[model samples]
Target: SMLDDAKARLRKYDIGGKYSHLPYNKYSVLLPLVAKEGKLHLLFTVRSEKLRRAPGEVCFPGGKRDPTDMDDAATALREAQEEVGLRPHQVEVVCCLVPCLIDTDTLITPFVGLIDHNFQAQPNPAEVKDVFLVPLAYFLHPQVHDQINHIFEYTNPEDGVTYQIKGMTANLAVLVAFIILEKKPT
Candidate 1:
């Protein structure tokens, strides 16, 4: 039960009080696919080992917002095009989500977009190493995510938060908490 777990979590949306505000320097692009059969998938990237930040980590097709770009949305689309060969015309912008502040140094603003099934993917050499899709339903599955205790270090505090999730330490925690918690559109 994803439905039951999701409902229980939703009831505690504000249980953690609130995280402190932080200024972030990076941004990401996200494309959600609703297949003809009603299955949903999310496009993701496996960053190249050469990247400075989060090297070899799984992420969306996006990067920092360029000042020359018209806006955040433009930056997201531009980054997607540059990193994964996704043309601006290939996506239909749905809306944007509230900016999520991960810490004092990172603010991620998620852009919601719809993509057609016919579009192909091409990952860039400079930024991304590979590209793939993960079914939304899989993420929603509680059995697919298992928690494990781990440590996190931040600049502000000498101590860190200990947590657990499926996968390894940080990777599992991020995917489980962020992607799994998000609601899938029907």
Candidate 2:
């Protein structure tokens, strides 16, 4: 009954259906969270320098959808398993967020999944350099955002053009915190 109620409520916000005609490459990411010491923490990965695209950037476990993949959720799960060694049994998918359209013509679907607290992370060196954890409570605090000082222009190798990403100085912790808090049960 609870799942059905949640699904019904979620169905009310089917706005993405209107944009189905657009052309875009589909990608999916898994936001893995684990309860640790009675507190929740999110897992993040630093991309390996060996990667061809976006090397050394911090991101969640995911990748572009392959032709043989079943769906977005499947893509997320498969990527998570390959990137972080997170087995399918260790994760319980909560829900998927609204797909985000990037300026690069990619549509990314983010799936929130609860993971076992003790699950060991075996990151693939070719794709991930390191794995780290951030406590959920850290984002709930305001002081974290004020510490952002780094700023740099991102250059697209394909276009040989540099773009100033405004949010380069913004703390992503706050953004993820807001999303989790909003979706969390009261």
Candidate 3:
């Protein structure tokens, strides 16, 4: 019931809309948690090298909220579905965390959600280059990040090249792990 407890805690501490007036580009990012291999894993994507915005970088499935999105949660789910083929019904969204600022212009609203472990990804090649998952507890390790500065390097076996999980992606992962797992890196 680790995830259950985490969801409850997230509900209690979620900081949504506190910065609604940041007056910057608003983006919603989905923090998808999977109950795989007996524990939990977080999903991440590598941006398509062809794209111009942070291309070839790592991030959660999301982008600038569509003008038609009903809310931050809606944006997160819609983008997730578009970028990774994750259906809205397949995710049990938990809560929206504190908003984050990027590049002094973009604001990110992060939503936590538990996703079906069996779900397969249908990545949009125009947006996502690749996808990978990391155990939730992996970041609890003391040596998870250091060298590159503000990055978590995940060397996926499928490609054998370490992928950098940085920016809002790394920030949200560390933040969510602390709240959900109730432990600090040691």
Candidate 4:
């Protein structure tokens, strides 16, 4: 059933989008899920205010791919470890989701990982200001909405590949809710 479901889901996405011909920086993020007290929870991080970019923003634990990283999964794991004290052994990666392109030059791969409910998080003050958990049930309700703000066509600077990009803006709560609901259960 899972295989059939995966196939059906895969068919729903148009995966022929053009990518940049220029060398792009790759990044990865870890979606850490935990099970506790008979409920599922998602972990998040608040970026340190002292950071140069996007300071004080809420995000998952991850960063840009390192040269020594073997693959996207390795990048996710290493970043998680450095940011939140999550050891590679403590995370059981479920799967890597479809890669997404952002800012016209960055390729980001997101990996879903299951962590122990009792896992302790040590936030790195240089990178993370704080850590928090949200229960899965909080997103199961139907009070959220999504809105598409604009759609545009752009050409890659390096290869001159044209791509149609659709930008959607939504409340953070609603977006997080939709993500957890869509992600496979741990």
Best by TM-score: 3
Winner on lDDT (2 vs 3): 3
Which pairs of residues have clashing backbones in candidate 3?
none
Model 2 bad stretches (over 4 Å): 1-22, 142-176, 182-186
Residue pairs clashing, model 2: none
lDDT of each: 0.56, 0.67, 0.82, 0.64
Per-prediction tally of clashes: 5, 0, 0, 0
Q: How good is model 1 by TM-score? A: 0.63
After superposition, candidate 1 runs with Cα above 4 Å error: 1-26, 34-38, 142-186
* Pairs that collide, model 1: 24-107, 146-166, 147-165, 148-164, 148-165
lDDT string, candidate 2, 43-151, tens digits: 8777899888778777788988888887678899999999989998998876666667778888877776778766999999988987776665555653322225533
Of 1 and 2, the candidate ranking higher by TM-score = 2
Model 2 lDDT-worst window of ten: 162-171
Please provide the root mean square deviation of candidate 1 (C-alpha atoms, Å). Answer: 10.5
TM-score of 4: 0.67
Alpha-carbon TM-score of each model against the true structure: 0.63, 0.71, 0.87, 0.67
Superposed model 4: Cα runs more than 4 Å off: 1-23, 142-186
**Per-residue lDDT of 83-180 in model 1, one digit per residue for the tens?**
88888778876545455656577766666566767788877788888666554544434333223643332221224422112222234324434643
Give the winner by lDDT. 3
lDDT, candidate 4, 80-134, per-residue tens: 9999999877887765655667888788776667796557999989999877766
